[PDB]
Structure formats: C-alpha cells, structure tokens
Amino acid sequence: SYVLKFLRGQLPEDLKDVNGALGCLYGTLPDVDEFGQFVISPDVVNSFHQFGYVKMPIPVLDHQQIDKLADEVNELANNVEHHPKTERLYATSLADLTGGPLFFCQGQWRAAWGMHDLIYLPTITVAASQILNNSLVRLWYDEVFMKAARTGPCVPWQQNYARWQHTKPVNHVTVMIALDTMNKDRGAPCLVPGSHRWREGGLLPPVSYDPTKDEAHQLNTIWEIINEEEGEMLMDTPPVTVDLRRGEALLIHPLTLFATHGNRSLDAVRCCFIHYMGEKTYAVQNGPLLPHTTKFQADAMIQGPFYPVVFDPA
Amino acid sequence: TALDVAMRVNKLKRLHQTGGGPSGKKQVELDAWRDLNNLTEAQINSAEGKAVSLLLNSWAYFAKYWEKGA
Amino acid sequence: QVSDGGRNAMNAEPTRQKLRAMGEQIGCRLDEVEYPALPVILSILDVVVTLKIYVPKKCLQVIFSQANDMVAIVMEQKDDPITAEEGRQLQALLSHYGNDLAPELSQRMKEAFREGVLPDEAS
Amino acid sequence: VSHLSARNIATEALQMKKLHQERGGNPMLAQQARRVLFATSIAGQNLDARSVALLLNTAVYFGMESDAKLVRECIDYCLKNDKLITVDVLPIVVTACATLKSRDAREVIEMQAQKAARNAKFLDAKDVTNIISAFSKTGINHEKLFAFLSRRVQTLARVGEFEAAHLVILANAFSRLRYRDKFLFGAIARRAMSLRERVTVNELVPLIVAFSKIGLKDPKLSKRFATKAMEYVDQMNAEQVASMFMAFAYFGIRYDQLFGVLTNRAVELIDEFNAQYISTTLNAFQRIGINNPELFDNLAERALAVVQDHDARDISKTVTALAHFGLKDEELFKRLASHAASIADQFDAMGLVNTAHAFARTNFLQQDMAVALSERSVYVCRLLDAGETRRLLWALAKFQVRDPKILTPVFNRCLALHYDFFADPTGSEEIEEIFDFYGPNFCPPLYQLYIS
Amino acid sequence: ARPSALHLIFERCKLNLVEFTAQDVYQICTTAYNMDTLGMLQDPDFMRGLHDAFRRSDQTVISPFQANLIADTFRKVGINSMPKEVSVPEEDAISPESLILVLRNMNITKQRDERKINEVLKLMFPILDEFSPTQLSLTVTELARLKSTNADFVGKLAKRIMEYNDDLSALDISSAAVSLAYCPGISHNILYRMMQIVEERMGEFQPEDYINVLHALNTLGPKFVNTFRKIVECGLQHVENMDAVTLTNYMVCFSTMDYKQREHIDIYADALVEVATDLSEKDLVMAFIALQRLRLLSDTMFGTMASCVIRYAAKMDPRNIAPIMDICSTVPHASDHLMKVLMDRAVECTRILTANQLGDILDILGLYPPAREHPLVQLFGKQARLRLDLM
Amino acid sequence: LHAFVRSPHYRTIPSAGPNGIVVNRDMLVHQFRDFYKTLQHCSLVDKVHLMSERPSVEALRVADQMVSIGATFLEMPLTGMEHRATEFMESMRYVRGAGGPSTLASYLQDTENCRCNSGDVVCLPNGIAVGHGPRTNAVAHTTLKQLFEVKDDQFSFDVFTLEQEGDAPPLGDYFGFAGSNVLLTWKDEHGLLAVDQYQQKQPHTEMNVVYLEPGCHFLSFYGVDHTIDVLVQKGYERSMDSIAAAGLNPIPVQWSEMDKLGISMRAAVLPLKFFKANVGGMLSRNKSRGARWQTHQ
RNA sequence: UUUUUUUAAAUAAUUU
RNA sequence: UAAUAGAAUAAGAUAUAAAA
C-alpha cells in the first residue's frame, strides 16, 4: 500500500509482528556461527537437574540495561497517564484503574522496547535450550512483579505447572531476573531443594490464599499441602532463600515449589520471569490458550506469531 | 547505640587532622581501628543515616593513613 | 465594503453618506454609556475619527472625563494595564479634538509620559 | 558516539530521518537510529529550543511512543518553556506531537495553535506552508486559524511568492483538512498558471489529485487541468497514470479524449503495475462508471502474478471492483480468497465488510476465507455504521455461520442503530433475506422491530 | 576489600534499609568526591542505592548548590539524576527570601519555568519596598540570567536600586549595569540614567568592574558611545598594566562603537599584543577579529597574532576555524603554515561540521591555490552531497 | 537592512486621484507586484517584509511613521495622522517581529508645537540635512539640533537647515545623495536651490551634481556598503543615461499609478538597520562583500 | 482580471 | 564553601457531499 511520508519509519501497532529483534539493549543478534560464546558449563546443568534450580554464574545484563528495564517497568504502571499499547497485554493489575500494593503484568513483550528484546537474549536462551535437551525453544510468556515499599505482599507456595494444565507435555523451564537488589527482607525467592521429583512428577494440591494476613502464616501454609515423606524431606532440606544482585539470573524447574517474600525495605522491588518451552509441545483442548490468541485444535503443535521461536540449534 | 561510637571516632579523626595527640597519630589510628571494628550486627542493623554517614566518612579518611587498604 | 470602481461605482458616494448619517444617530447619544476600560473608548473614537462622523461636544467631554478617572487610578495606585501606545493614541485624539475639552487629562497624561508609569507592548 | 554532545546527536538524527524518509528505507539506518536514540537524555545540559524539538521529532518518527523517556523529557521542556518556541520551531513540535495522543500532547498542540493564530499576520512564504502542513498532519478543527492562514496565503500569492513545491504542499494541506474555500484554491491555481513551465509532471500530478479530492465542483478548472495533463502523458510513470485515473474519477466529469490516451499508456506499462496500481485503477473505473473490458482483462491478468504482493486494502478494492462489473476470474478469486484468509488480521473495520460482501455477492463461497473473516468480525463489529452492519450481517448469513460468539456482537450493533438500520430503502430486500435464514427465533427484539 | 562491619554497612545501604536525609547524602557524596579509598564511585550497586535514598528525601533543607552537586556527582558515575523542583510559597510562607530562593533554585539546577517565574513576579510586587538593597541586586541578576521578557518589573527594580545610589558599592553598580544591559526590552531612559551613575564613581572601578562595564557597553550599542569615551580616557593612565582579557574587551568595544579617534586605538592595540600570549582560545579569536575589523593588522601585528594562534591551531574548535580562515584572507601577508594546519584540522573534523560551517569553509577555500591539491576537496564533496538535505 | 512595504487594498482604491486624473486599479496592483519583485532582486536588502492590506489607501505611505538618524530611531509627531495611529501600531508589530527595536524614541512627540515629517531629512555624509518648509516648524529644527548636533575634532555630527518654498515637495523626493560623492537633484528650481544651499553651508566640498528630469521619482539606499543600485522611473530615459554615466546602476521600475495618486518611491518603503545584541565580549560574523586572496591571483 | 476581516459577547434548559 | 553563554537552516496522497 502507500505509507505516508511521515509514517514510513513507525513500528507495528504491537511488537508481535516485528520479525526478529530490535537493536535496543545489546544491538543485533550474533551470527549463526557466533552462538557458541554464550554456552554454559555442564556443572550448572547438573545442578539444575539435581536441585530443580540453579543460578547463572555471571550477571546477564550491564547496569545501564537494568536501569533502562527498571524505567520500562516503572512506566508500565503509571496509573495517571496509562501506558500506550496497554490493550496488547494478556492481564494487568490496573484493569480496575486503581492498582494496589502489588503490580503484576503478563505478556509485556508485545508492549515495550527492551522487554521484547530481552526475550531473545542469547545468554539465557542458550542455557534454557541446554536444559531442554538442545531443541528449538519457544517463549511461553513473560511476567513482571513490582511490590511497593513497607506494604508489599508475598505470593504463597505455588507450582508453575499448575497454571499450564491446558498444555499436554511437561517440557518447560523458567528464568527469573532481578531488576533490583533482592534479599529476604525484599521479595527474595525461596525454593525447596529436590521438590520437582516428589509426586512422581505430579502436581500438589493448590494452597489456600487468605489475604490481609502476616507473611509468616502465608509462608508457613506449606505444611498443609504436603504429605509425611515430603515433610521429612522438608525437615532434612528446609526451604532456601536466594540472594540476587541487580542483574543475576536464576533457572527454576516448572515443578519445584517456589515462593517470594514480602517487601519491608524503603523502596519498591522489581523482578521479571520468562517461561521457556520446548519444541515437542501440544495442546489438549480446542480454542485459544491465552486471551485473544490463535486457536488450536486437539493435539496441535504450538506455533504462530504469539509463540515465536527464539533460538534454533541449526 | 552506634551514634556515640560514631561521634567519638569523629572526635578522634578531628584530633588526628589537627595534631597528633599525646600518644601519637599511629596510636590514634590503632584506637580508631579497634573502635570501628567494635561494631556488631545489632547497632548496624538499627543505625540511622547520620551515624552511618559519619562512620563511612571516618573510615574512608583513616584508610589513606593506614598501610593496608581496609 | 463599498467599491469606488465597481459595477455600482456611481452609487458608492451616496451609500457612504447614508452610513455616516446612521453613525451620527449613534454618535449623538454617546454620554449615557459607562466605559469599563480604555480600549472601548479608543475603539469608538477611532471609528468616529476615521469615518469622519460628527459628534457633539457634550459626549466628547463626558468621554474624556470618564477616561481621566481611569488614567488617574492607573497613575496613582500603581499596585493593582494601560500600555504606552494606547496612551499616545488617547493624547493624539484629545489634541485633534482640542485640549479645551479636558484640561486635567492633558497635563496628567503628559506627566505619565514623563515619569514612565505606562509599560510597553513588548512587556 | 559518546563524545558527541546533544546538539550533534540532534543534527545526526535529523540527517538520518531525512536519509530514511527520502532515499530508501534501508533497515540498517532505522535500527541504528533507534539504538542511538534509545540511550540519550536531555538532563543537566542547557539546550536550545531547536535542538530539543529536533530530538523529539526524530525520536517520535522512529517509532518511539509517549512512554519513552526522551519523549517525556522533550515534552516537559516544551510545556515549561513556551515563549522560547518561536514560529521557526513550531512546525517541528506540532509534527512530533501529531501522532502522540495524551494529555500533554493535546495541551501543547492547543497552545501552539493559539500562538500561530495570534501571529498569523506576520509570517512569510516558508512559515505559512510549514505551519499549515504541520497542522494538517494532526487532526485539529481550529477554523479561525485556518481562515487567518488562508487570508495570509492569498495576500502572499497575489504578489507571487510561492513555487511549485509550495503550491503542492499548500494544496495537499488544505485538502486534507476538508477546508472548502473557493478563493484560496482559485488563487493557488492562478499562481500555478503564472508559474507556467516551472511545474513539471512530478509537481503537477499531486496538484490534480488534491484539487479533485477537495471537490470544488468547478468544471472550469477541471477542463484546464485535463488539457494541461494531455501533453504530459508520454512522460508519466505507472504510479502517475493510476494517480490521474483516481483523480479524474474523483472529478466526476467524463473526458473521453483523455481517458483513451490514459488507457493506451496504462496498457503500454502493464509490466510495471504492482497490486496497488491495479487496485487503484479498478477502483477509479468503478467510481467513474465507465466499463472497458479490454483494459480489464490485462489488469486481471497482471493481478494474477502478483497475488503475494496484495495487501488487505488492495484485495478489498480489487474484489469489490471486480464484483461490481460482473467479471469472472475463478483462479484470481480463489487466490485472493486464500490470501485474505492468510492475512485476516490486517483488515480494518470497513475493509473486512466490503471484502465479505463482495465475495458473497458473487456465488463464490470458500471455507478458508469464510471462517477467518467471521472470526475477525468480532473485533470490528464496534466500529460499523448501520448500512455496513446490514451488509456484514447479510454476508455472514450467506456464509451459513451460526456460532453465537460471532452473531452476538453484530446483532448488538444492529440493535443499537435500529432506526438507521430500517430506514435505508436500498437495503430493504437484503433485510428480507437475512431473516429468511435466521428466523424469528434469533434475536426476537430485532424481529419485533422488523414487523413494525 | 570490605571488612565485616564495612561490608554490613554497605549491604544495609544497598538494600535501601537506612533512612537518609539530604544532609547525610550530601556528606557521603562530599567524602566520595574528596577521597576514593573505599571505592564508593566504583560500586554501581551502592551509588544506585544512594540515588534511591536521595530521590525519596526532602531536598528543601539543603542549599540549591548542594542539590546540584549531588546531581552532578551522580551524573558523573552514570546515573541520570535531577533534583526536585521547588514549589512556589503559598499563604504565610510569603517572604522576600523564599521568593529569591525560588529563582536561585531554578537558576543553579537548570530548571527554567516561565509559569513559575510569572507567578513569583506577580507576588513579589506589593512587598518591593520591604526588600533590602542587596536583595534587589540579587533579584536583578537572577532575572537577567533567566532571560525573562518582563522588562517592566526589571525596570522597576532598577529604579528602586538607583534610589539607593549611596548604599551600593562599585561591584554592585557594575553588576546592576551589566544585568540591565542584558535585558532586551528595558526602556532607554533608565538605561541612560544607569550609565550616568556608572559615569561617576569612575576611579573606584576594579578590573572586574571594568570588565562588567565594557560588557554592558558592548551589549548596548553605539548610542552610548559618549559614556564609553570616559572609559577609554580613564584607562589611558593604566594601559601599561592591564589584564589581557580587559584589553580584549577594550578591542571588542572599539570595534563595536566604531570609534574614530585613532591614537587611543593604536595605543591600546600596541599594549594588547604585548601580552596577547596569555589569552585563551576564544579571547584570542576575538582579539584577532576585532583587530581585523579596525584595519590594524600590519606585518608584525599579523605575525605575532598568527604565532600566538598556531599553538591552539592543533585542537581548534570547529566554530573557530572559519573566522581565522577569513582573517587570513583580505590581508597581503604570508600565512601558509597557519593555512596548512587549519586545513588539516578541518579535514580531521569533517564528520561533525554543520552545514553552515562546511559551506563557510568551502567558500573561504574556494579561491585558495594550495587548497586544490588536498584530500579536503573530495572529503568535503562527499560530505556536502550527504548534507544537501540540511542546507 | 530590512525593507518594509504594504500591499494595496484593491476594493477601496480611489477612482480618480487628486487633480481629477484617472487611475487603473489592475495596473496599480501589477506595478506594486513589479516593485516588490525589484526590491527582492536587490542584493543589499537582507529581507523585504510585506504587511497585510489596510482599508485606506494612505496606508501605502508607510515611510511617514519614523526616521533613522544614525543609531536613533525617532518617531514622528502624531499631530496630523490621528486616523493612522492604529496603522502605526500594526507597523510597529511588524518591526518588532523581525527582531528590531522594542520601541521608538519619543523625543519629538513630547515637545510642543514640533511639526515635522519623515522625508525632509537627508542622511548626508557627516550628518543630516533638514529642510525648512511649511510642513516642519522651527521648533523641530531646534529640537533636532539639540538632540543630535555635536561639534568635535572627530565626534562631529552636522545638522543643516535648507530653506524651501511652500509648494516644494518634501526634500527626500527631489534632493538626495547617492553613491558616495554623487548628489542627485531634480533639474528644478527647488533642486538647484537646495544644491546651492548645501554647497554654501558646507564650503570647500567636492561632489558631482547630477540633474534628473522633473517628475522622475528615485530611491537610493545610501550607506557604507556603497551600493550603487538607484531605482528610477521607467518613462524617463535621460535621467537613466545620466545615472549610468556617473558609474551607477539604474534599475527601471514602472511607477505610473502610484505617481498619479501622489505617492513616490521614497514614501512607499521603510528601510531600517537592525543588529543582534552580543552578550559578553562578542563579534558576530558578517557576510563578505569583496574578493578573496587578491595577492595570489 | 478582482471581491476577506478588528467584541469582555453568557438569556437555550433540565432531572440524563 | 562553590554559577559563564557563541551557531540561524523548507517534502508532497486516509475509501464522502447542488449554482457572479
């Protein structure tokens, strides 16, 4: 068609249509024969497959990049001048136009620069592909958590695979990146070692969420969903809280128990999750897996513009 | 608390800045080192801004005179 | 809106006269009104002078006396926006119609020019 | 790039924009400019109004939205320092804020509109054209400012202070705003006539297009434009041929001596026709009403080899034009239906309805396009007129679609506009077809309104 | 290396777990800028936390320049910081001091706001009498720096300043003169009276006062030439010992005023070129231009000035290549070495020259014989072809 | 140097100028277009500004507002142009827009019974020359002399009074200096009288005198730039030959209709000299007007 | 071929 | 405890509508 002379350089209405990656954070993606620099050591892979989690030895982002990403997260929750492309989001805590002490966002890779770029970050996608047995890895979705200062709540015990029951096979991983320095007094991730292999790769019953209650009970509700043997393994290996720097990344199994603490510092705390999924993955029902997305039928392979292939071992 | 030790270390640092004292400036540095390492988790977990700022000022000032970095 | 060289050019001059006549009807009754601000007086006087309407002396005296209080307030209070060009225009209009109409306004107005109370249009 | 101050960054950003919007769209220059502008900040440094305006303009042109920092800092500066934005950097700020739609952008645009309204009498040749084009980019309805600018343009053009490019810019700017003023366009036409040979074909075609778009209904200048264009046919490009086809269909007057030569030149360059040119030509022929099968066969044949090049707009226009004239091309129709099924998410509010109705009017039903368009109708139901809603409902009834998740939005839209729905006579027959399929069971209130 | 207590304090400050007032952050930043023993500037996770502490504190306690200094020391590391804007005082917070502080804050931290200026001026008028003589001069200076167009209020302030002629000193008189000359719309009556006051108290002036008066007279224009006369007569007895910047200002005023008594011009130029070697790049450029405009470049004049400028010729600013290039023309003296070095410097910076500067350089070198056999012609041709859109 | 002009108002153009002579409005518009184009083609004028049309024809006389003497922009007394005050404010807005002075000097307006007009002053070399006619009184002479006349070995400014008769037009219309040493005067009685008085007042003065034909309006931008462009009327060819013979550049301009209404070339343009305020010791760049590298070639 | 203007304007009506 | 300034510059199609 004919694009007006002052609209030639614009981007699509949503960044999903943009094939490839923009050069915003780390420039252009490396060449085909340049992807071996970002490989990770086998011991990290063994640690993940043993504990159900591991920390990447090197921070994945420079401090300027973390500053830019924190600015994007701040602008995603303006609440006075709402973010453009807000209608391109799977779910938002500002749908009520009031917000609260916890701001959670999903599918923001179609909304802002940099967040879309972070998906194709080589250092994390190569590691996730190595965890997923060297196959094509497709983004499942992102997530952003922002907790206010002195009142931020905590999300209790949960399993990631409990939210993805519409997807047939167990082939996933999660990468969590800290956009601000975190510790047990501000949203630290607390995980149980060796919990991804408890119920023969099964899902534990959901926990009871009662808001407006102290963090101690919220984190102690764990003794309600487990059995005696899981209790003994808990006693041997109590849940461990992990400290993260301003750029450090953490790989988590989909099936390991996971929680985050409250925020009792004097500033808001930010973190970002991205879930990565393997090639051989099918659907179970007929329809869209996420709101306003391409619909699948029976056991159809999951592809499309909504689940782009981020890395290819060929 | 920690404010008292902070201001006494500040007094020591002023004494070193002006003169050297009856015993000497090296002895002043040693006393400042001991007083600075006296702090334990309780106070530094409950210190306010002024005390922390003064403690960092004194430690940074005395790090130039100490042979080791500290 | 009258053209001196159009289709009805020969009818241009009488129409002009008619307009001037209907101006005077308005111009004669110019003392009953109360001017809130100087630009109203200046617009009326520009209209009457440019178009050469005849105005009786009584309404002229009322107009100038009304303007005198406003300029005196502006000069004296100095704490409260008569620009300098508007004041120049008022002085020139009074001079054209004769300074015997309001002797106080001429002296006050000249003194305002001398001191510099009136600001400029740029400010 | 670190040793460059903000002034040099602004100059190089302007250079990159000028190189990209004119000499090709090299996907390298755009991405380099995006990367450079993503790491710049107007903070802690004193900058002129022009440099800040240039940075804002070149940032917004390259996709940066109203959530970016650079944009926020430039907008804040433009809000705080208003008297520093003279009449030289007003067009840059207005053009930059045209596409941004927020509170601050609206406030800045209004303030600049009032500033240009006050100083409309002291502008010169460059400023009037730049300001009027910049205000035509944004959608604003300040009539008094337009009147003042048109008066100043007439006063300037009486003495002859406009060139061919200025005339084209002014004509397009005043036609885009739907400001119908006979004297201004007469003055522009007379200035071009005085220019004589200084207007070439490239500076003549947009003049005719804009003069047709404004719709003055003056048959005195249309004939003169046609006569002037008759000599320049042999030098025209294919895009120019399509542009004059559209323009003289917009005029509405029949000039056979011109249409014949245009048809011959269009046939000569049939190998240079893209899909856009074919769609434009067929739409122009549909609008003017002439029926010329000889050119139509060649257009249809050339459209068959560029199927993959078709956009949503081109598919819609081509299919509607082909269906109006009763031309049958089963291969072209099948390929267009498949392609429309592939890109069903690119149809706008009215293109979808036009495509569906054009496909349903002829007896051509294909499930691939039918399912895609029926599913896509949900997101464009809310932007439809009463007649367009009736057409969409009839086309959907022809496709035999019964999914309630599709039919609820269209029935809601047609119920909300029932008066205009049932007051259009030309569609009355269509109404009796629609309820012949769904029956009184489907949406009883609509049936009760129909009986009355 | 951070020991246990030092590491724990660093961690506490890193986690935003300590409440910091503006004073404490200022003290820590001063310590960091003074001494680098603990590596404060080398820990991004520490200065980021300090910046977060600074944003959420009350910055109104400290002086404007302290906030500016914290902002500058954060900018130097790599953190984009800006101190918060001060709100206009309301209700009983009204006072001359706070109304001066608003302007001072807007001045130092580079946050100009026309709306806040207008609001402040509309609220300082009634109490103009209560103001002290020094506050009047401070307000005049602040309004002159902010490029305010409200010349009426500046004139009122200037009149109230003149009413206290006895109280003011030479420095205050010079500051008032230059700050009045900088305002564009000031009425010429007040300007005439201020230059009349400057005309007396002439012997009390210091080199800073001379610089201020010469700046004001250069800004004003030929209309005040008479006053400038008494200046050149006044300095005729000190000319053998003056600062180089003062003589450069004298040359600039001589060129602007179109002075015609040539003996003073010759004496002052002769005194200037004795110490011209002490001038900076900019002042050297302007001495050269002013001497050229007065038709005083003899052979020794040009030789000495070229020898002085060849030192800065290695790293000339782009804005200074063209003027000296023009001065090298229109004179019948040998300037081959200066021309060659300037052409080399022009070649070096061919990717940063704006369109106007490139056009000026190409124009000046158009008729130069030795400029044809150089890479500059081809490089500038390519640059001009690229930049034709911006010309 | 900025030159200001005003476009004619076609609808309200007078049918028959004073004296009953006839005028053609289309030709008047065409001749003003030709004048504007000729002004733009002049190299010395940096910009030509065109103000919006005003209802009266007298608004075409924009030169009556003020006068430029040295660096002083003196505003003429508003004693006979009361209906033209608003036009003067509108012209001052145009002057301010182009970066010129904020406001005009009001020295003449404050003085009483100070009748004068722009046009009786000639910016002669080494001062101005004023004419003592009916339109200007002796009070204007005395006020101008006190304001601008200074006697010095070098800071010298000369004001000359030149007596003229009642029927003589304003001095600028017929007596004016051109080039650098050339005095252009109408081969009329008033022109010869003015030339003789100027020669006498200033004795031992050497400057060529050129006599044009009567009725040949002319305009010359007199300044240091020594521009030789001298605009003259089209009809008279002998004045054109005389100007060319003195080493000048006559630029023919059709000036029939404007002449028929009583307006001359000098009364139709407003020339002003602006500058940019230079904060701090500063020497703004100036455009060149000569040749470069004379010695090399 | 040419045709245009320069107020502080404040009185609608309703249960939306 | 903290205050110095320079530049004048123009790109161009959104699928509508009654009378010298």
Summarize the structure.
Chain B: This is RNA-editing substrate-binding complex 7 protein domain-containing protein. This is part of a larger assembly, with chains A (314 residues), B (70 residues), C (123 residues), D (452 residues), E (391 residues) and F (297 residues). Helices cover 17% and strands 18% of the residues of chain A.
Rg from alpha-carbon coordinates of chain F: 20 Å
Biggest sheet of chain D: strands, sense, closure? Answer: none
Order of helices and strands of chain F: EHEEEHHEEHEEEHEEEHEHE
Total beta strands of chain D: 0
For the largest interface, the chains and their residue counts are: E-F, 38 and 26 residues
Number of helices of chain F: 7
| Gyration radius over CA of chain D | 26 Å
User: Which percent range fits the helix content of chain F?
Assistant: 10-25%
Report what the structure shows.
The structure is cut from a larger assembly and holds chains A (314 residues), B (70 residues), C (123 residues), D (452 residues), E (391 residues) and F (297 residues). Chain B has 70 residues and is an all-alpha fold. Chain B is built from four helices and no strands. Chain B is 73% helix and 0% strand. The longest helix of chain B is centred in the C-terminal third of the chain and has 17 residues. Chain B is globular, with a radius of gyration of 12 Å. Chain D is mostly helical and 452 residues long. Chain D is 68% helix and 0% strand. Chain D starts with 5 loop residues before the first helix and ends with a helix. With 391 residues, chain E is mainly alpha-helical. Chain E is built from 20 helices and no strands. Chain E is globular and about 75 Å long. Chains in contact: A-D, A-E, B-E, C-E, C-F, D-E, D-F, E-F. Chains E and F meet through helix 11, helix 13, helix 15 and helix 17 of E and loops of F. Chain D binds two RNA strands through helix 7, helix 8, helix 9, helix 11 and helix 17.
Helices and strands, with pairings:
The structure is cut from a larger assembly and holds chains A (314 residues), B (70 residues), C (123 residues), D (452 residues), E (391 residues) and F (297 residues).
Chain A: H1 42-51, E1 53-55, H2 63-75, E2 91-92, E3 102-106, H3 115-119, H4 122-131, E4 137-147, E5 172-178, E6 189-191, H5 215-220, H6 228-236, E7 240-241, E8 249-252, E9 258-260, E10 269-277, E11 287-288, E12 295-296, E13 309-311
Antiparallel strand pairs in A: 1-8, 2-3, 3-4, 4-10, 4-13, 5-8, 5-10, 6-7, 6-9, 11-12
Chain B: H1 3-18, H2 25-38, H3 41-44, H4 49-65
Helix pairs in contact in B: 1-2, 1-4, 2-4
Chain E: H1 4-14, H2 22-34, H3 44-55, H4 64-77, H5 96-108, H6 114-124, H7 133-145, H8 151-162, H9 170-182, H10 188-199, H11 207-220, H12 225-234, H13 244-257, H14 262-275, H15 281-293, H16 299-309, H17 318-328, H18 336-348, H19 355-364, H20 375-387
Helix pairs in contact in E: 1-3, 2-4, 5-7, 7-8, 7-9, 9-10, 9-11, 11-13, 13-14, 13-15, 15-17, 17-18, 17-19, 18-20, 19-20
The structure holds two RNA strands.
